């Protein structure tokens, strides 16, 4: 197909199982437990619709928003707890927690 990834979300391996890599595309990339999510994370602590990474351009910082998750979305180095709907701009190599799951965003 035609869509070209403009980013990558890495889900670290751990107690929940092996690592995963998800391509991120222009527009809205939904993170959640639903199999239809752009970034599907089939784990009990992840909300059905957990967060959204919106990418407007390959060379502009994405927008991360929590979608009213139960267990939260957080940014590390330094710690930051995201309020539902509020824009957070992602930097290259950003470490993100969706609930208890550690992830890392990469520019391509």
């Amino acid at each position: 197909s035609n869509v070209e990834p403009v980013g990558r979300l890495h889900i670290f391996s751990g107690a929940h199982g092996p690592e995963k890599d998800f391509p991120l595309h222009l527009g809205k990339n939904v993170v959640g437990r639903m199999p239809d999510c752009s970034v599907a994370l089939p784990f009990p602590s992840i909300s059905k619709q957990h967060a959204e990474i919106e990418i407007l351009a390959w060379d502009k910082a994405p927008i991360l928003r929590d979608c009213g998750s139960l267990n939260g979305t957080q940014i590390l180095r330094p710690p930051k707890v995201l309020s539902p709907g509020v824009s957070h701009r992602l930097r290259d190599q950003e470490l993100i927690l969706f609930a208890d799951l550690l992830c890392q965003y990469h520019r391509l």
Binding site: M34, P44, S45, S47, K48, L70, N71, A99, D100
Partner: peptide, 8 residues
């Protein structure tokens, strides 16, 4: 799908 499980 079932409800999200709170971290306890």
């Amino acid at each position: 799908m079932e409800d999200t499980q709170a971290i306890d």
